[PDB]
Design an enzyme around this catalytic site. Structure first.
Site, PDB file in Angstrom:
ATOM      1  N   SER B  39      -1.617   6.402 -22.513  1.00  0.00           N
ATOM      2  CA  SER B  39      -2.462   6.788 -21.372  1.00  0.00           C
ATOM      3  C   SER B  39      -2.391   5.719 -20.302  1.00  0.00           C
ATOM      4  CB  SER B  39      -3.936   6.942 -21.794  1.00  0.00           C
ATOM      5  OG  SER B  39      -4.700   7.157 -20.575  1.00  0.00           O
ATOM      6  N   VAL B  44      -3.039  -1.870 -21.151  1.00  0.00           N
ATOM      7  CA  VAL B  44      -1.673  -2.178 -21.614  1.00  0.00           C
ATOM      8  C   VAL B  44      -0.651  -1.204 -21.020  1.00  0.00           C
ATOM      9  CG1 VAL B  44      -0.308  -1.847 -23.678  1.00  0.00           C
ATOM     10  CG2 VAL B  44      -2.013  -3.611 -23.638  1.00  0.00           C
ATOM     11  N   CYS B  45      -1.003   0.088 -20.935  1.00  0.00           N
ATOM     12  CA  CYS B  45      -0.089   1.068 -20.360  1.00  0.00           C
ATOM     13  C   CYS B  45      -0.017   0.948 -18.845  1.00  0.00           C
ATOM     14  CB  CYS B  45      -0.491   2.505 -20.717  1.00  0.00           C
ATOM     15  SG  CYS B  45      -0.511   2.707 -22.553  1.00  0.00           S
ATOM     16  N   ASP B  46      -1.121   0.601 -18.210  1.00  0.00           N
ATOM     17  CA  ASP B  46      -1.090   0.264 -16.793  1.00  0.00           C
ATOM     18  C   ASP B  46      -0.107  -0.875 -16.538  1.00  0.00           C
ATOM     19  OD1 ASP B  46      -2.099  -1.212 -14.356  1.00  0.00           O
ATOM     20  OD2 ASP B  46      -3.671   0.280 -14.311  1.00  0.00           O
ATOM     21  N   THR B  49       3.499   0.343 -16.943  1.00  0.00           N
ATOM     22  CA  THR B  49       3.925   1.168 -15.807  1.00  0.00           C
ATOM     23  C   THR B  49       4.255   0.292 -14.595  1.00  0.00           C
ATOM     24  OG1 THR B  49       2.535   3.003 -16.644  1.00  0.00           O
ATOM     25  CG2 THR B  49       3.184   3.069 -14.390  1.00  0.00           C
TER      26      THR B  49
END
Lengths: 149, 149
Positions: B39, B44-46, B49
Protein backbone atom coordinates in the site's frame (compact mmCIF):
# COMPACT_ATOMS: atom_id res chain seq x y z
CA UNK A 1 -28.64 -10.28 0.66
CA UNK A 2 -31.51 -7.75 1.23
CA UNK A 3 -31.74 -5.97 4.62
CA UNK A 4 -35.27 -5.18 5.76
CA UNK A 5 -36.23 -2.78 8.56
CA UNK A 6 -37.32 -4.83 11.55
CA UNK A 7 -34.95 -7.67 10.90
CA UNK A 8 -31.98 -8.36 13.17
CA UNK A 9 -28.81 -7.14 11.45
CA UNK A 10 -26.40 -9.82 10.16
CA UNK A 11 -22.87 -10.04 11.52
CA UNK A 12 -19.81 -9.27 9.42
CA UNK A 13 -16.02 -9.26 9.67
CA UNK A 14 -14.03 -6.09 8.75
CA UNK A 15 -10.58 -4.63 9.60
CA UNK A 16 -9.88 -1.65 11.83
CA UNK A 17 -7.07 0.80 11.07
CA UNK A 18 -4.56 -1.41 12.92
CA UNK A 19 -5.63 -4.54 11.00
CA UNK A 20 -7.51 -6.04 13.98
CA UNK A 21 -10.58 -8.02 13.01
CA UNK A 22 -13.80 -6.24 14.06
CA UNK A 23 -17.30 -7.70 14.15
CA UNK A 24 -20.69 -6.44 15.19
CA UNK A 25 -20.07 -7.98 18.66
CA UNK A 26 -17.27 -5.48 19.20
CA UNK A 27 -20.02 -2.87 19.71
CA UNK A 28 -22.37 -4.99 21.80
CA UNK A 29 -25.01 -3.15 23.78
CA UNK A 30 -24.72 0.07 21.73
CA UNK A 31 -26.93 1.52 19.07
CA UNK A 32 -25.10 1.93 15.75
CA UNK A 33 -25.33 4.34 12.86
CA UNK A 34 -23.56 2.59 9.97
CA UNK A 35 -22.56 4.98 7.18
CA UNK A 36 -21.38 3.16 4.04
CA UNK A 37 -19.39 4.94 1.34
CA UNK A 38 -17.68 4.06 -1.97
CA UNK A 39 -14.48 5.73 -0.77
CA UNK A 40 -13.55 8.16 2.00
CA UNK A 41 -11.07 9.60 -0.46
CA UNK A 42 -13.87 11.29 -2.47
CA UNK A 43 -15.35 14.62 -1.42
CA UNK A 44 -19.04 13.64 -1.03
CA UNK A 45 -18.10 10.62 1.10
CA UNK A 46 -15.75 12.73 3.19
CA UNK A 47 -18.62 15.17 3.92
CA UNK A 48 -20.99 12.30 4.70
CA UNK A 49 -18.48 10.79 7.18
CA UNK A 50 -17.82 14.11 8.91
CA UNK A 51 -21.46 15.13 9.20
CA UNK A 52 -22.66 11.84 10.74
CA UNK A 53 -19.75 11.90 13.14
CA UNK A 54 -20.28 15.48 14.25
CA UNK A 55 -24.08 15.37 14.44
CA UNK A 56 -24.62 11.99 16.21
CA UNK A 57 -24.27 11.84 19.99
CA UNK A 58 -21.32 9.54 20.68
CA UNK A 59 -22.17 9.15 24.29
CA UNK A 60 -25.39 7.55 23.12
CA UNK A 61 -24.07 4.97 20.61
CA UNK A 62 -21.46 4.39 17.90
CA UNK A 63 -21.09 5.84 14.36
CA UNK A 64 -19.36 3.30 12.06
CA UNK A 65 -17.98 4.24 8.65
CA UNK A 66 -17.46 1.19 6.40
CA UNK A 67 -15.90 1.16 2.90
CA UNK A 68 -13.67 -0.89 0.63
CA UNK A 69 -10.84 1.63 1.14
CA UNK A 70 -7.74 -0.17 2.43
CA UNK A 71 -7.26 0.22 6.23
CA UNK A 72 -4.14 2.27 5.39
CA UNK A 73 -6.24 4.88 3.50
CA UNK A 74 -8.80 5.12 6.32
CA UNK A 75 -6.03 5.59 8.94
CA UNK A 76 -4.40 8.28 6.84
CA UNK A 77 -7.79 9.99 6.25
CA UNK A 78 -8.47 10.26 9.97
CA UNK A 79 -4.98 11.71 10.56
CA UNK A 80 -5.38 14.28 7.76
CA UNK A 81 -8.83 15.31 9.06
CA UNK A 82 -7.22 15.70 12.49
CA UNK A 83 -10.00 13.55 14.10
CA UNK A 84 -9.20 10.80 16.68
CA UNK A 85 -12.79 9.95 17.62
CA UNK A 86 -13.91 8.67 14.20
CA UNK A 87 -14.33 4.91 13.64
CA UNK A 88 -13.46 3.72 10.12
CA UNK A 89 -13.53 0.02 9.17
CA UNK A 90 -12.36 -1.64 5.98
CA UNK A 91 -14.38 -4.25 4.06
CA UNK A 92 -11.67 -4.61 1.38
CA UNK A 93 -10.57 -8.19 1.97
CA UNK A 94 -13.79 -10.19 1.61
CA UNK A 95 -16.69 -7.73 1.20
CA UNK A 96 -18.15 -9.52 4.20
CA UNK A 97 -20.09 -6.43 5.27
CA UNK A 98 -21.05 -5.42 1.72
CA UNK A 99 -22.33 -8.86 0.76
CA UNK A 100 -24.23 -9.35 4.02
CA UNK A 101 -25.91 -5.92 3.79
CA UNK A 102 -26.58 -6.01 0.05
CA UNK A 103 -24.56 -2.92 -0.83
CA UNK A 104 -21.79 -4.16 -3.14
CA UNK A 105 -21.47 -2.26 -6.46
CA UNK A 106 -20.24 -5.42 -8.20
CA UNK A 107 -18.78 -3.98 -11.42
CA UNK A 108 -16.70 -1.49 -9.37
CA UNK A 109 -15.93 -3.65 -6.27
CA UNK A 110 -16.89 -0.69 -4.07
CA UNK A 111 -19.69 -0.30 -1.51
CA UNK A 112 -22.75 1.76 -2.46
CA UNK A 113 -23.60 4.88 -0.43
CA UNK A 114 -25.98 3.63 2.27
CA UNK A 115 -27.03 4.24 5.86
CA UNK A 116 -28.30 1.70 8.40
CA UNK A 117 -29.37 2.42 11.96
CA UNK A 118 -29.35 -0.47 14.42
CA UNK A 119 -30.83 -0.30 17.89
CA UNK A 120 -28.89 -1.69 20.89
CA UNK A 121 -30.33 -5.17 20.08
CA UNK A 122 -29.14 -4.83 16.44
CA UNK A 123 -32.67 -4.53 15.13
CA UNK A 124 -32.56 -2.50 11.91
CA UNK A 125 -34.70 0.60 12.58
CA UNK A 126 -33.70 2.65 9.51
CA UNK A 127 -32.23 1.92 6.06
CA UNK A 128 -31.37 4.15 3.09
CA UNK A 129 -29.58 2.98 -0.04
CA UNK A 130 -28.88 6.32 -1.61
CA UNK A 131 -30.46 6.52 -5.03
CA UNK A 132 -28.55 7.55 -8.06
CA UNK A 133 -28.79 11.24 -8.71
CA UNK A 134 -29.39 12.06 -5.07
CA UNK A 135 -26.94 14.58 -3.67
CA UNK A 136 -26.42 13.05 -0.15
CA UNK A 137 -28.13 10.54 2.16
CA UNK A 138 -30.99 11.91 4.27
CA UNK A 139 -28.87 12.80 7.31
CA UNK A 140 -31.83 14.14 9.31
CA UNK A 141 -33.99 10.99 8.93
CA UNK A 142 -31.12 8.68 9.89
CA UNK A 143 -30.08 10.92 12.83
CA UNK A 144 -33.68 11.03 14.03
CA UNK A 145 -33.95 7.24 14.01
CA UNK A 146 -30.63 6.97 15.88
CA UNK A 147 -31.65 9.68 18.41
CA UNK A 148 -35.07 7.95 18.94
CA UNK A 149 -33.59 4.78 20.36
CA UNK B 1 1.65 -18.44 -11.64
CA UNK B 2 5.37 -17.90 -11.16
CA UNK B 3 7.31 -15.42 -13.29
CA UNK B 4 11.08 -16.00 -13.45
CA UNK B 5 13.84 -14.02 -15.11
CA UNK B 6 13.91 -14.82 -18.83
CA UNK B 7 10.12 -15.28 -18.95
CA UNK B 8 7.75 -12.99 -20.89
CA UNK B 9 5.67 -10.42 -19.07
CA UNK B 10 1.99 -11.35 -18.70
CA UNK B 11 -0.72 -8.93 -19.70
CA UNK B 12 -2.73 -7.19 -16.99
CA UNK B 13 -5.74 -4.88 -16.67
CA UNK B 14 -5.50 -2.23 -13.92
CA UNK B 15 -7.05 1.18 -13.23
CA UNK B 16 -5.33 4.55 -13.48
CA UNK B 17 -6.19 7.36 -11.00
CA UNK B 18 -9.15 8.44 -13.16
CA UNK B 19 -10.59 4.84 -13.28
CA UNK B 20 -9.60 4.32 -16.93
CA UNK B 21 -8.49 0.79 -17.76
CA UNK B 22 -4.75 0.40 -18.40
CA UNK B 23 -3.05 -2.71 -19.87
CA UNK B 24 0.48 -3.77 -20.72
CA UNK B 25 -0.01 -2.58 -24.26
CA UNK B 26 -0.38 1.03 -23.08
CA UNK B 27 3.37 0.95 -22.47
CA UNK B 28 4.42 -0.76 -25.71
CA UNK B 29 7.96 -0.13 -26.97
CA UNK B 30 9.33 1.13 -23.61
CA UNK B 31 11.36 -0.69 -21.00
CA UNK B 32 9.63 -0.88 -17.59
CA UNK B 33 10.53 -0.93 -13.90
CA UNK B 34 7.42 -2.26 -12.13
CA UNK B 35 7.45 -1.61 -8.35
CA UNK B 36 4.75 -3.55 -6.47
CA UNK B 37 3.72 -2.51 -2.94
CA UNK B 38 1.14 -3.60 -0.35
CA UNK B 39 0.00 0.00 0.00
CA UNK B 40 1.32 3.43 -0.89
CA UNK B 41 -0.28 4.68 2.34
CA UNK B 42 2.42 2.98 4.40
CA UNK B 43 5.72 4.77 4.96
CA UNK B 44 7.97 1.96 3.70
CA UNK B 45 6.03 1.70 0.42
CA UNK B 46 5.95 5.48 0.09
CA UNK B 47 9.76 5.44 0.38
CA UNK B 48 10.04 2.61 -2.16
CA UNK B 49 7.83 4.51 -4.65
CA UNK B 50 9.76 7.78 -4.25
CA UNK B 51 13.14 6.08 -4.55
CA UNK B 52 12.46 4.11 -7.74
CA UNK B 53 10.87 7.17 -9.36
CA UNK B 54 13.69 9.52 -8.42
CA UNK B 55 16.56 7.15 -9.21
CA UNK B 56 15.32 5.70 -12.51
CA UNK B 57 15.82 7.64 -15.72
CA UNK B 58 12.33 8.24 -17.06
CA UNK B 59 13.06 8.89 -20.56
CA UNK B 60 14.71 5.55 -21.05
CA UNK B 61 11.47 3.90 -19.99
CA UNK B 62 8.55 3.82 -17.56
CA UNK B 63 8.39 3.34 -13.76
CA UNK B 64 5.04 1.78 -12.82
CA UNK B 65 3.82 1.47 -9.22
CA UNK B 66 1.10 -1.12 -8.80
CA UNK B 67 -0.83 -1.91 -5.61
CA UNK B 68 -4.28 -2.89 -4.36
CA UNK B 69 -4.88 0.66 -3.04
CA UNK B 70 -8.12 2.09 -4.44
CA UNK B 71 -7.53 4.53 -7.32
CA UNK B 72 -8.81 7.32 -5.09
CA UNK B 73 -6.01 6.71 -2.56
CA UNK B 74 -3.38 6.68 -5.33
CA UNK B 75 -4.78 9.91 -6.81
CA UNK B 76 -4.71 11.67 -3.43
CA UNK B 77 -1.18 10.33 -2.77
CA UNK B 78 0.14 11.81 -6.03
CA UNK B 79 -1.62 15.13 -5.35
CA UNK B 80 -0.32 15.44 -1.74
CA UNK B 81 3.19 14.43 -2.75
CA UNK B 82 3.08 17.17 -5.38
CA UNK B 83 4.19 14.41 -7.75
CA UNK B 84 2.32 14.73 -11.06
CA UNK B 85 4.75 12.62 -13.09
CA UNK B 86 4.53 9.49 -10.90
CA UNK B 87 2.47 6.67 -12.44
CA UNK B 88 0.40 4.71 -9.94
CA UNK B 89 -2.04 1.96 -11.00
CA UNK B 90 -4.66 0.11 -8.97
CA UNK B 91 -5.12 -3.66 -9.07
CA UNK B 92 -7.95 -3.51 -6.52
CA UNK B 93 -10.86 -4.69 -8.68
CA UNK B 94 -9.64 -8.06 -10.05
CA UNK B 95 -6.06 -8.65 -8.83
CA UNK B 96 -5.41 -9.09 -12.57
CA UNK B 97 -1.79 -7.94 -12.24
CA UNK B 98 -1.15 -9.64 -8.91
CA UNK B 99 -2.43 -13.02 -10.00
CA UNK B 100 -0.72 -12.91 -13.39
CA UNK B 101 2.60 -11.98 -11.82
CA UNK B 102 2.37 -14.31 -8.80
CA UNK B 103 2.54 -11.56 -6.14
CA UNK B 104 -0.82 -11.76 -4.29
CA UNK B 105 -0.60 -12.26 -0.53
CA UNK B 106 -3.79 -14.24 -0.64
CA UNK B 107 -4.47 -14.17 3.12
CA UNK B 108 -4.40 -10.30 3.06
CA UNK B 109 -5.71 -9.53 -0.45
CA UNK B 110 -2.70 -7.20 -0.82
CA UNK B 111 0.21 -7.40 -3.24
CA UNK B 112 3.62 -8.50 -2.00
CA UNK B 113 6.53 -6.00 -2.19
CA UNK B 114 8.26 -6.90 -5.43
CA UNK B 115 10.14 -5.45 -8.38
CA UNK B 116 10.07 -6.58 -12.02
CA UNK B 117 12.25 -5.12 -14.78
CA UNK B 118 11.05 -5.60 -18.37
CA UNK B 119 12.95 -4.78 -21.51
CA UNK B 120 11.10 -3.25 -24.47
CA UNK B 121 10.28 -6.76 -25.81
CA UNK B 122 8.63 -7.46 -22.41
CA UNK B 123 11.26 -9.99 -21.46
CA UNK B 124 11.56 -10.05 -17.67
CA UNK B 125 15.27 -9.33 -17.18
CA UNK B 126 15.15 -8.93 -13.37
CA UNK B 127 12.74 -9.96 -10.60
CA UNK B 128 12.76 -9.71 -6.79
CA UNK B 129 9.99 -10.68 -4.38
CA UNK B 130 11.07 -9.18 -1.08
CA UNK B 131 11.22 -11.93 1.50
CA UNK B 132 9.42 -11.54 4.78
CA UNK B 133 11.83 -10.20 7.36
CA UNK B 134 13.88 -8.23 4.85
CA UNK B 135 13.90 -4.49 5.32
CA UNK B 136 13.62 -3.21 1.69
CA UNK B 137 13.87 -4.31 -1.96
CA UNK B 138 17.40 -4.31 -3.46
CA UNK B 139 17.03 -0.90 -5.10
CA UNK B 140 20.52 -0.86 -6.57
CA UNK B 141 20.26 -4.27 -8.25
CA UNK B 142 16.87 -3.45 -9.79
CA UNK B 143 18.06 0.01 -10.97
CA UNK B 144 21.26 -1.46 -12.46
CA UNK B 145 19.26 -4.07 -14.34
CA UNK B 146 16.94 -1.36 -15.66
CA UNK B 147 19.84 0.91 -16.69
CA UNK B 148 21.71 -1.94 -18.41
CA UNK B 149 18.91 -2.80 -20.90
Amino acid sequence: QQINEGDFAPDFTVLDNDLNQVTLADYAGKKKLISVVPSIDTGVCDQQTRKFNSDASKEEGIVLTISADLPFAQKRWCASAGLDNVITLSDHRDLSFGENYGVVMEELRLLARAVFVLDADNKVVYKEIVSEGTDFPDFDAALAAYKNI
